[PDB]
Symmetry: D2
């Protein structure tokens, strides 16, 4: 027995039991009973033993407009671990004019031997060449079973209905799942330019230039297209009442529509973009921050089991280095905010306030995502046979989130100042302790790529 | 170690692992690892090890219009066990003019020392006396934390909005959950009488006399009342697209609305009431059987995680002895159909047809119900600390459901003739084997009452 | 030619033409062309020639809780005339324990020889006796073709679904139209009492004790019942987004559902009940005043042609004499507000603000109501054969509405202080000038009863 | 007095009166009273005197894929007159690479001195050049105040959201109304090609290749874009429950959304495309024929006043000459069906079956369209000052619609075989009798262009 975790309360999505764990060769081999001798023994007394967090929506390392993101695959995964997240599914981005394979290879270069935690890939298709699209017949067998496309971001990521339909079609044939950023780009452009023309350049206009309708329409269209092709689809970052409604309408018609939300959409509002002295720039992410009523809508949807997970959509644009190129034009502000580390703690506060149950926390934060994106049961819960990806949670620990205490390469936190109750203490990745009582103690060589399974839905 | 289950695949709502189990003193004490010696060892090779079924909607023993139901607490619980269900929550029915306590005592008389499996009680309030309503302040502490009322059945079970509001109010104060049969009784009566007046007396008119609108309206009203009192509510047997829609609308408004469906609403249709030679009488249950499009609607809702469970609403009215008093007036036909035994197999067929996942099967059939009605984690899953309520499922076993092979006191099955794949083989109740390879081998003294926990939602 | 109206612009719901009118024997006999000599000639230069207003929702003379209303059939009809309204359909109220006929006779006593303008009756059924209900087979032939019931006001007006269904059924047989006040009375009572118990007695609680859900639910139920009986139904005073939504859903299902709104629901808000020094008592009407967003919803619905009319629901409870019995308990405040006189001017302001068209003003204010309640084309528009019920409107006239300038017996106006553009100047009732340049010059003997036509929808 | 119409019943949208008419110099100068001498007198005894029909959706003369339509501006307008329609608003189609002016001039060439009845133009923008779009600032002042764009028909008519937004924007500035053919072209193409690839080429696939969702999505998107620009929009040919629903949702949000339907969408179904021997080709129009349930939905919507009119979308593709190029590929079948002549009779049958009222018939068939497209009150009703555009209707006349009896250049009728009650007998265009007791007796020089008014909504 390599490791034994005793005196803790094992909390899975469908179980709560005070028992001891036996880890052997990166896997959980025994729960309860006589465990025997063990190299190391961890005392989880007064703590929860949760499955490791699984963030299926990250942009760990990116290059936007010749400039690079503050975080790298190494700096982000370390923060992820310190935040209780042991698996991540980053968005492998294709380069215009290049192949998907060229993209995967590029990603391997960034991840290989540098990820503190395990990782899988989603493939972004932003240059739908006949050959590129034909590659979707190949990537699945490499363990990349989810294709992602954008309906916004003209001349950068945006593709059209013809493309989406072709992607939906290839996904059905290869048993893959299409993911989509649903915003009507043209509608946004129209408003963005109209605002700038009127001399309106503050961060707030990032939100006003792309109101709920922009998201709602695109969402509905994508779902409609999925219905036509008769394919499963996954709507990333559903952020407001109107777009959620379309997802709901699609589900009732029988469309295999799936959706998710992201931490910040349960806590931030467009008013945050009005914080003085360009601080609002920090909250310039897409879709735009909504309103508090949307927070209730989303939390209720969570409690009712509507969403598949609460991911982070983690980005790293230095407030100083990157957000800066926009102090005079919100359009130039690189979109995105950090949160891969804070995800669990923030979502967990919902169990503290009765918004969501303790058991649902695990479902949303790890088990359900794992199921959808083909990593269950190897990843996701805590059962015999599971990789020993574990988080020892202290439900009573109180703390204020400060970027100075975070573990990535950013110059600010989206949750700076938030008081939380319930903190990740020590983390295990396939049996190895990578975070011990708050200190990262792993190797950038620990993380491994995950060939994810097909037929998602 | 009293018992060891080896070579099986443990399937909980959030886990799938090939491991062995160790049962000691009615509880699961160890999973995986070195188990040691054991009184008995069961070979679950090639079989699933599921948590025991939990049916929160049964009418095991009833007396309707001076006549008694074919099944008793003893005959039903035995059938339940043979069907893979180890816990049941029967509806303890108050008698007009009598107290709730008088009712519970009466139920204990029927269950005590006679239940093959464990059981809890829901309390039906059909005579809202000032004192009776004041009793709702007491029952909770006895372990009866769910109050049930009827919106239909004039001069028998029907109560009014004033009552429902008082019940919703008492439930909020005692941390209980109000359950409701939602049909507009008056609307039904109007149509029932109108049909009989026109000389229409066949079974089909049972359905036509209470169409979807009758259910939908009542559902909406109940949810509206729950919204006003600001209390959680549970809608029993949601059977069609229109009523489900109201539940959905309520959920979006923020109403803590919960709902469920029942096996037969996923398989039977009003056309079944047209089967020749009074056979349709067998399908006279309430609300009425709907249409196939409603089956898709419900299954989709299940797959999307809308419902809390799929219960049975088990009743026992002999086709000959009881249904008979209605061969000339559908109104005289006692409402209800049997299914406590077939529940799991029938719901399981949904995993066979991709309608629902293997993991969701357990969620719906046992884990989610247990959670809602305060029996989790003692009951519900398979974890260390759980009562050893287990079902060893043979996913390959094929069989035709025939009443001659069922184990209750009825003269017919609602699923007579259905071919199924996946059958319950041996069942354990808190460690004791009560069903061995298909043969009931327990004692009517095995079942125990369960003091269920409060604050349901 | 008794009268000739020249130089005016005739504005009907479907026509705008500068032409002269020829009135002979209470009717419009010629439009345009050579008119010839005439007893009197009116110069409508620079003015609109609108059909006379038709208010199908008035409570001109009432007795609530032993006390009588400030206005009588005489004082109200005079105000109506001065406001441009020439026809009215008052709610003839049955007395508990008495017949409908007894009620009509009582009404005739109040109206006969005392109405300044023409009038018809709606019959309120608040004591559904077998005989009473059987009377609905008679009233229609007397010219009373619309039955009204209440879903709220316990022990005063409230009837049940059984009653409503019986009424809906009688209406279908006699070709009548059922009207309904849709609020869940029990839900309201629950909240009303709960508030008082907590010591909350200010006027505001009149609104909070009966929020939108209370109205919405009842509305839906009534429409559902209408659907079951398969009968046309008319929802009086739809006041908010949620209840309107139910009307809309009913219409889509094919239910012959009709609805209306009332002047004050386009201008007042629940915040008005918070006006200091018990002033809010003036705004205590039912359903409660909503919010501004509901004003937009309603106006949009009007512009889209959803509603059949904008009536007033005119009541007369002296702010001093009557509202007073409630300075310590909002529940004791008699419900209702005045507006029969201000109706047209207030609705007309909507054409000034582009909310509604000039042509729709007439449709809503007179032509559509006349059509629905069987008085078209005798009443309603301006065509050859129409009764000469006319209003000469000055679109440029500006004025502030002050009760001191109104013409009824009330001590306040619901629109006190409102600045308006467009005032009624001279009014004709079947050819007779009853209001001349702002001065009432008619006789309480001018008004006549109207036997209204059947089959409304 | 040039003409006098006596003994008839004048039926306008808001009036029904037995009176005589006096026409002088193309206008109605007097109604009722002493008319005097007249060049000609028409006896409308036992007949209705309706305002002339107004069809705002025609394609009288078209050129699709090098081939020309069977009907010309002359042959169509004659049929229109014989059908009771006196005004038409044809879709002036721009040619790729050419200006809008070039298009108008081309249209004048076709209409000038050749139209049997009056006509206006809608301008189709299918080549959104910077200059072309700038022309929208000019056309309005020429009397062309409605811009039409297509969301389907790739490489032929289809424009994008960027275009639509620019058009919506220009319309708001020039006080014009944007009209749109709402179908997701790409979605359709995907299905069209998929079907052909599978060897499915029969006419039925024209419908299946573009199901309700295709229409619904586009409809919603257009309305969403209109909402963003905050402009009024008009959805042409709403054909089913799902697309109508989007219009309805838009209206509730406050979007100034208008919509219409077309005769054939109230009578034909996709099953018609299955008629044997390529007959189904006759029913190949777009959007595709729906189902009977959609007929009820639409008729109910009509009765509730949802739509602005029931136009025809008149096209002329010879069953033999044109439909033929598709006996082996439904895609090659030119889309469109004839109906400008049958429109009124067909819609009128709805009043016969209680689906719609007699008064609504006129509203939909003439008065409401005239209002929306800025031709009211010159055109639309029957009032003093109106152009004398009249139809003398015989409500008792029965007849079977046969193409051999129609008056255009087509080889078939979409309503061949339909038995109707109520036929147009004699028609007047601005005072001149152009159809006398069923015989066309006008001159192709009678019709004149109409400079329509701005700000439509
Ligand atoms: Zn995104
Ligand atoms: Zn993203
Ligand atoms: Zn029931
Ligand atoms: Zn039941
Ligand atoms: Zn009322
Ligand atoms: Zn009233
Ligand atoms: Zn079209
Ligand atoms: Zn067209």
């Amino acid at each position: 027995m390599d490791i034994i975790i005793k005196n803790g309360t094992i909390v899975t999505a469908d179980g709560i039991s005070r028992a001891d764990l036996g880890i052997k060769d990166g896997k959980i081999t025994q729960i309860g009973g006589a465990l025997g001798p063990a190299e190391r023994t961890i005392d989880a007394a007064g703590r929860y033993v949760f499955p490791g967090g699984i963030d299926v929506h990250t942009h760990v390392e990116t290059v936007s407009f010749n400039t690079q993101s503050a975080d790298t695959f190494a700096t982000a995964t370390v923060a992820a671990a310190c935040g209780g997240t042991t698996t991540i599914v980053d968005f492998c981005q294709q380069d215009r004019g290049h192949s998907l394979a060229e993209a995967v290879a590029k990603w391997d270069g960034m991840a290989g031997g540098k990820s503190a935690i395990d990782y899988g890939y989603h493939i972004i298709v932003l240059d739908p060449t006949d050959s590129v699209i034909e590659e979707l017949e190949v990537l699945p067998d490499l363990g990349i079973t989810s294709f992602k496309v954008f309906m916004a971001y003209r001349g950068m990521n945006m593709i059209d209905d013809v493309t989406l339909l072709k992607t939906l079609d290839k996904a059905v044939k290869t048993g893959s799942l299409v993911m989509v950023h649903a915003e009507n780009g043209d509608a946004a452009d129209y408003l963005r330019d109209k605002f700038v023309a009127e001399g309106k350049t503050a961060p707030i206009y990032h939100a006003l230039s792309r109101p709920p309708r922009v998201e709602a329409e695109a969402t509905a269209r994508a779902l409609a297209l999925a219905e036509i092709v008769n394919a499963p689809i996954y709507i990333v970052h559903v952020t407001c009442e109107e777009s959620l409604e379309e997802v709901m309408r699609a589900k009732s018609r029988g469309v295999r529509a799936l959706a998710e939300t992201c931490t910040h959409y349960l806590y931030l509002t467009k008013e945050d973009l009005e914080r003085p002295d360009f601080e609002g720039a920090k909250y310039v992410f897409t879709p735009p921050a909504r309103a508090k009523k949307d927070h209730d809508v989303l939390w209720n949807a969570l409690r009712n089991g509507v969403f598949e997970t609460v991911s982070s959509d983690h980005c790293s644009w230095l407030f100083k280095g990157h957000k800066d190129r926009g102090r005079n034009d919100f359009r130039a502000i690189p979109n995105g905010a950090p949160g891969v580390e804070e995800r669990l703690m923030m979502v967990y506060q919902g169990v503290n306030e009765g918004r969501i149950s303790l058991t649902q926390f695990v479902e949303l934060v790890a088990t359900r995502p794992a199921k959808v994106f083909g990593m269950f049961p190897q990843k996701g819960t805590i059962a015999v046979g599971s990789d020993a990806d574990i988080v020892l949670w202290d439900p009573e620990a109180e703390m204020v989130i400060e970027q100075t205490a975070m573990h990535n390469a950013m110059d600010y936190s989206s949750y700076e100042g938030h008081k939380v109750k319930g903190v990740p203490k020590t983390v295990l990745l396939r049996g190895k302790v990578i975070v011990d009582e708050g200190s990262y103690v792993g190797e950038p060589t620990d993380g491994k790529f995950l060939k994810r399974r097909k037929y998602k839905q």
